[PDB]
């Protein structure tokens, strides 16, 4: 896939992703907060189309992500992120995609997710997150 | 004065300030680095004119500020920042302004200046700096 | 179980835990580094006995943990940490305990684990980790 790395910011305002209930996660794009101002991140897209878009608008600054979970699996011989779920202090968004494979989860007791980086080919190959106080 | 607060960034690329060798520091503006991209900060200007502009272009990323020093004094009955000096790991820029009053300095053993905030009326009233690893 | 919270330190030198290949993780104790000096953390013990002790001596400071993984499951009706694995930049220690239940893993691209907190009754109920640069 094509790697991407948004870097770190002040916070997260909105997340736009797409998925396919038979394959995995497709496109990924985030609208971060840069010192009180919305910052529109680059839209990282799948080499292919046919996904279902989803917009996750957070009630920034009072609402923030507390846990990120999902599943990684095999699709057409590639290991990818098949499902994703975002749990904030106000609501649970997801799961999105296919909930099959091996599960993973990142609960946060103290701190904030301030950035994303990963890779996307036909699907989201992998991803990492920037953490900060 | 009019307060300003740029917030925090990834680093500093260029600093643009103006001064008057009889009064104090006037305008202040910074070009920060935002995850590898130049970010042009807002130009905070003096209520008045007649200052001498100065551009401090740093050889980012290999060159960074190690110490900030200067003088605070009385001008027309107001306490302001009369002088400023920026010492990097490669060169010393300044002093700029009037070197009279009480001195102050911030040497940094480990860490980086990633943001500025302060206030400017006819002159730079005061300022603070964001520090990060 | 009885909660514990070691707090944060400079690093990790040695980890001492015990487990039972039929049940789950039992005792947990860490020898941290406090500014260049070994700091013997409190030994958090299980309400019961019959576990197999394991000592994980890291080659501090060149050797550090890069990933922590494990399994959480049901034992006598309680959800606990049944297995634990520590992967450093030099070796893999584990798995220890029973590798059954739902898996979890924490890979670290940049940063260090500098502290542990959790709870222990008959077994390790849950745990969290302190991260820093």
């Amino acid at each position: 896939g094509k790697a991407f790395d948004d870097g770190a910011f002040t916070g997260i305002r909105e997340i736009n992703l797409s998925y396919n209930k038979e394959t995995a996660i497709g496109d990924f794009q985030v609208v971060y907060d840069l010192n009180g101002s919305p910052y529109v991140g680059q839209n990282h897209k799948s080499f292919i189309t046919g996904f279902t878009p989803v917009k996750i608008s957070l009630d920034f600054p009072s609402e923030y992500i507390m846990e990120v979970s999902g599943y990684t699996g095999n699709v057409s011989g590639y290991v990818v992120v098949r499902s994703l779920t975002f749990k904030t202090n106000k609501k649970t968004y997801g799961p999105y995609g296919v909930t099959s494979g091996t599960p993973f989860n990142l609960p946060i007791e103290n701190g904030l997710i301030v950035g994303f980086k990963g890779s996307i080919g036909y699907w989201l190959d992998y991803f990492s997150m920037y953490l900060s106080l | 004065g009019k307060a300003f607060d740029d917030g925090a960034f990834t680093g500093i690329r260029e600093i643009n300030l103006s001064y008057n060798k009889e009064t104090a520091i006037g305008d202040f503006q910074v070009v920060y680095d935002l995850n590898g991209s130049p970010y042009v900060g807002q130009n905070h200007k003096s209520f008045i004119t007649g200052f001498t502009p100065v551009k401090i272009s740093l050889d980012f990323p290999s060159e960074y500020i190690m110490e900030v020093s200067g003088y605070t004094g009385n001008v027309s009955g107001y306490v302001v920042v009369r002088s400023l000096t920026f010492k990097t790991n490669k060169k010393t820029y300044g002093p700029y302004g009037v070197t009279s009053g009480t001195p102050f300095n911030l040497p940094i053993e480990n860490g980086l200046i990633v943001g500025f905030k302060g206030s400017i009326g006819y002159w730079l009233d005061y300022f603070s700096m964001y520090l990060s690893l | 179980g009885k909660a514990f919270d070691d707090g944060a330190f400079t690093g990790i030198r040695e980890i001492n835990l015990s487990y039972n290949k039929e049940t789950a993780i039992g005792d947990f104790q860490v020898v941290y580094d406090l500014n260049g000096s070994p700091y013997v953390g409190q030994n958090h013990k299980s309400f019961i006995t019959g576990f197999t002790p394991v000592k994980i001596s890291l080659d501090f400071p060149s050797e550090y943990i890069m990933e922590v993984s494990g399994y959480t499951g049901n034992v006598s009706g309680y959800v606990v940490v049944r297995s634990l694995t520590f992967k450093t930049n030099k070796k893999t220690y584990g798995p220890y305990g029973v590798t059954s239940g739902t898996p979890f893993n924490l890979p670290i691209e940049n940063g260090l684990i500098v502290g542990f907190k959790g709870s222990i009754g008959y077994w390790l109920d849950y745990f969290s980790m302190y991260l820093s640069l």
């Binding site: - | 500093i12 990323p61 | 893993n105 890979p107 691209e109 820093s132």
Partner: peptide, 15 residues
Amino acid sequence: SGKSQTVIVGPWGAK
């Protein structure tokens, strides 16, 4: 160097 750093956890997915 002159680039600010922050903690990063991951990756999850393809090795």
